[PDB]
């Protein structure tokens, strides 16, 4: 399957590029998917290149791009006709699949999330510039819902995120954190038994200590419910 | 060690034999006023044969001290308990038990 | 977007391709109190000098407008 | 008495012989009872007809794709019910009895298809991409029951639906269904006639296994014929090329290849029978 | 307090989610969790919680769900799973039932009557909390049933009175919180079967004359539809029991009427229908159309069943209520619409319900009732564990328990009707699905798919035919690890071979692409190495590769004593179109170098495996010999017979195999006293492949070849003469010489 | 076997290899190229059988440019050739 152009002067005569109908169907949807992937990739690459230790860090551009990406992957709402909801869900699934199988971005989105070395919201903010350090919750929740809707369709990448078991333990934390990504991962799909069995005694005890340390979050109980039977397939399996 | 604090006297001389069952209506509670178990509210008394290890050693030894119709108030040191492991899900590890058994009849 | 065409630095056109929309007269202002769209035009009307026009981006899906903000690295009364 | 196989033998007597009374019953009766016009609302759409809601449920279930058609029993039962309701069909009044029968059939077809029955059939056909399950058989039976006599209204509705939705998977599913159609398969008969000893002595199963689904193929081709009956020629021009859609397939050509296949199979069967004297009953049935 | 939470937030939500966690942690059946949670919530607490009228709706729903999921959730699920089965024993009370109650015969009460179907066993336990065991079975203790029976109907009468009064203040919030948990608990209690007799009569008097005439929201409508479905299921069960009684009396009557008229040429000899045709062929032939005067009762009871009912019963009320519900307004929640129309069609197609319930009906004798109950409990446990990590031990125990049961082999049709085939198939799919290395490797489900199923059932032209459907999936996933082929190599191929063991029709029905697949899997073993028992790495075990494929092909191509020509043609064509073995004697050719292959094998046997290569070659030549066309047994003129014979003869080298068949590494083995090497060394039946190929292809066509060979097993004959010791080579050499029937030609 | 640019952190680091590999990349179309014309006015014509057009990958900014060894291996947007980037379409017949 791995070939090359080569073909000095005259190559092989039995060679013809059969064009495919990419106009329509894919069309404007896939075009703006590719363009948004391009723009987001370039922008966040410039950010993380600038994020390598303390030109000034963009902030307003970050907020604008994050809000646009939130609006891009928005749920299709419920106060609509069934066929419109189905069309919107299919379009969103195509969006997620083209966002994933291409330049994944989600793996280096986690690299953007990696900058939790601040842990104070006051000292990194004023050594690196002005404000920031608080809109990280928007990043976490927004791309958590992105990953959730990405897997939600046809068992897309449950094993892709379950393979980051070390980073799953890293996401298992209690310091200015939201457990949305864990809840949506446990709710969406079991797939390979890893996604419902790598939660060992240590993970359960750490989540229980998250409940004990912080207040009654009322959301940890929901994911603990989801850590039990998920789709009915957990009938003593 | 049994630390019976009898609240109401009974027969005064009746002792449970080896081949006998102690019909009780125990409502044993854990420390800090926590009622982990209750046999009276189920409207069903408890049966157990003495000397067959069918009950915890503290409950068996406490029944071997009260008389017939003798309302009792027992306590259980972690020696006569579920051990350092404890009963899973209900009894915390290394905890004491407080019993307030009331033998209805001896058979 | 500067466009010199030196066959070595191509320009971009997707960010520049605009699609225009319903063209009305200035006395056709709409907005009688309240007003969705409910357009009353067949379409393909040729744009005449003085007609109020609407521009829409063929890629970004939005409409070119005059923002109510200011500055934009300028020092004047402009928008 | 331990091996009382009478409880299973009575199943053969009760499955179809006594089912004729119930088949003569219900069907049209329940079909007209559950659709008494606009009901009795006593209040714009008059809360929608119940079977309109049923057809909408079936259409939205077919719209929710899962890359595989399920085996819902409700589809089976109700497709059979509508097919029996719409297929009530010596020397009689050539201009009175015939016209009355045509008017009754048109009324029944209008009652069924006024609530989006054509869209349900079209979507169900477009869903199963070449899978020749019994759902496609029931859907094709409903389609030929709707298009019996070749109504222009249902043809126009299907044409405008396919034009406005740009459905490409429908024609691909039709091509796959016609490609997966069975054939005479002389080798199956050759293996079958060499049964236990001679003939079906064991009688374990009277399955055909030589001509798999003749009824399904006949129903599909009758549906295709009724789709272009009346010399509408708009379907005939559309079905050849489908110029509205990006992908073009020729169902006429595929029908020609299927005709080639069945012709070759029949010729091979005849030449295998060549030199023999008396046609047996099994060969007679297969030839018929 | 608890009622103070009706105005305070952040506590009602948290306690509701705590109740949800309590219910979910004890879901789909659990043992330790139920007994543990029986301490946090108690019987009087639950009674007071369901008793309160001012409780918030969320806490009411949570407490009802907790009570259902803790106390009454396992037996209800078991009964709902086993409802579709209709196992009926033989007792004097079973045949004493009537289809209609009396000569009035108006409708009959659905739930009121007599039932005798084999239901699962009711058995609760006690919490105790100071004892041993009581956890493994007999889930969370019996929250009292009589007080529940009284209180549920009492406050259900209260609830329907409040609903008829149309109050502005329900028990919880809206009327949904008032009605949904109540009807859920009522439905669970009804499907448990606790309600009966005068209590059920009062229930029918309450919900008919009923609350259906009132206005209900969507979930209440769904629960009422479920209740009506249960009522119709009970009616269908009553009809099935009446059919069982009729088919118990009439079968004996016709048995007498057929036994007396045995033979009293003839009238077509009755086509041997008296003795050689008394089977299902007679049952189909002994119809009620035209035979004797016995058909009067048959027609009478056919009419009795097909009175269109058991218009004049609950069916008209059900249909009218459903039509009114559809007429009232548009209906969302498509599950509700599906249930509505399913119930409507079921009411209008009672004959459909009868013809659905009939095939799964069975009549078991009254002497094996306890054994059948035990087997049914084991199947219930298997179905509960269906679709693990440590549940594999429980499944192994259940399969072992179902092994040692008389009902398995004495009633194979009942076993097939109970549908354990699909259960075991789903279990195996869940176990091996995922790839990698089949982490939970313990292949007993293949032994059960094989073994007693398709051995003791004896197919009856039905069991092996049903097993033939999953043949493609069985042969596709040729996994490794089963102890049946000694070491690993084929876990499901034993099942595949047992599917087509001794069924000529199934062997004929085998498709060419499956054989092409198996040929490809055999050709995939194009490798050789000097390790002990390596497959891809780690040569650890020093104790068969394509031999299992060859054995499966042998079973597929040779049924009874006969060689299927249609399978043999494609098998030999695909064998010669891709050479498999690595024969060093041929060297230049693809393989089949039998001149030096066995010599090299017997040389490497006494070297640092062993019988593996020799057994593989023996299996190959045995498959080829069984693949040969029958020499003048059926056809001897011409046509695809001399062709295949010449093709087999071409492999010259196979013409002269005397140096291999009559070879003398005979090895007395035990000899005087010791060295009985069973593991390493040629078997006495290893030359059975040689003699089978010779007899099938060449044979002793003239006595000149026999004289050239003189004694076929001359050195085997010397070994047999020297065997005059035992417990040695002689034990199998006797069988090898007994298979040498070719002197009798 | 459509033209493909590597990804999974292989892109934007090498960003030169033009893989002639198909498979799952086809319908999950990372392999997509947007063409641009030299002319501005009436740029989006119906395109005759032969006319030059520049090519840019939809995910990577590396414009398709040809090297001296009869291979493309891509090139940056700011560095393009005058005859190795034209890529005039070819009619049904070869030899110009």
Curated annotation (Swiss-Prot), chain A:
Disrupted-gene phenotype: Embryonically lethal. Embryos die at about 10 dpc, due to defects in heart tube development. Cardiac myotubes display enlarged rough endoplasmic reticulum and cytoplasmic vesicles that contain high levels of Ca(2+).
Tissue-wise expression: Highly expressed in heart, lung, cerebellum and brain. Detected at lower levels in adrenal gland, stomach, thymus, esophagus and ovary.
PTM summary: Channel activity is modulated by phosphorylation. Phosphorylation is increased in failing heart, leading to calcium leaks and increased cytoplasmic Ca(2+) levels.
Localization of this protein: Sarcoplasmic reticulum membrane
Family to which this protein belongs: Belongs to the ryanodine receptor (TC 1.A.3.1) family. RYR2 subfamily.
Function, in words: Cytosolic calcium-activated calcium channel that mediates the release of Ca(2+) from the sarcoplasmic reticulum into the cytosol and thereby plays a key role in triggering cardiac muscle contraction. Aberrant channel activation can lead to cardiac arrhythmia. In cardiac myocytes, calcium release is triggered by increased Ca(2+) cytosolic levels due to activation of the L-type calcium channel CACNA1C. The calcium channel activity is modulated by formation of heterotetramers with RYR3. Required for cellular calcium ion homeostasis. Required for embryonic heart development.
UniProt comment concerning the protein's domains: The calcium release channel activity resides in the C-terminal region while the remaining part of the protein resides in the cytoplasm.
Protein name: Ryanodine receptor 2
Organism, as annotated: Mus musculus
Organism classification: Eukaryota, Metazoa, Chordata, Craniata, Vertebrata
First-to-last residue of the parent protein present: 387 to 627 of 4966
Curated annotation (Swiss-Prot), chain B:
Enzyme Commission numbers on file: 5.2.1.8
Primary location group: cytoplasm
SUPFAM superfamilies found in the cross-reference section: FKBP-like
A family per Pfam: FKBP_C
GO BP term (any one): positive regulation of sequestering of calcium ion
GO MF annotations in UniProt: calcium channel inhibitor activity; calcium channel regulator activity; FK506 binding; peptidyl-prolyl cis-trans isomerase activity; signaling receptor binding; transmembrane transporter binding
Family membership noted in the UniProt record: Belongs to the FKBP-type PPIase family. FKBP1 subfamily.
Protein name according to UniProt: Peptidyl-prolyl cis-trans isomerase FKBP1B
Source organism of this protein record: Homo sapiens (Human)
Lineage: Eukaryota, Metazoa, Chordata, Craniata, Vertebrata
Gene: FKBP1B
UniProtKB/Swiss-Prot annotation, chain C:
Record's subcellular location: Sarcoplasmic reticulum membrane
Processing and modification events after translation: Channel activity is modulated by phosphorylation. Phosphorylation is increased in failing heart, leading to calcium leaks and increased cytoplasmic Ca(2+) levels.
Tissues of expression: Highly expressed in heart, lung, cerebellum and brain. Detected at lower levels in adrenal gland, stomach, thymus, esophagus and ovary.
Superkingdom of the organism of origin: Eukaryota
Phenotype of gene-disrupted mutants: Embryonically lethal. Embryos die at about 10 dpc, due to defects in heart tube development. Cardiac myotubes display enlarged rough endoplasmic reticulum and cytoplasmic vesicles that contain high levels of Ca(2+).
Start and end residues of each MIR domain: 44-79
Family assignment from sequence similarity: Belongs to the ryanodine receptor (TC 1.A.3.1) family. RYR2 subfamily.
Recorded domain comment: The calcium release channel activity resides in the C-terminal region while the remaining part of the protein resides in the cytoplasm.
Function: Cytosolic calcium-activated calcium channel that mediates the release of Ca(2+) from the sarcoplasmic reticulum into the cytosol and thereby plays a key role in triggering cardiac muscle contraction. Aberrant channel activation can lead to cardiac arrhythmia. In cardiac myocytes, calcium release is triggered by increased Ca(2+) cytosolic levels due to activation of the L-type calcium channel CACNA1C. The calcium channel activity is modulated by formation of heterotetramers with RYR3. Required for cellular calcium ion homeostasis. Required for embryonic heart development.
Listed name of the protein: Ryanodine receptor 2
Species the sequence originates in: Mus musculus
Gene expressing this chain: Ryr2
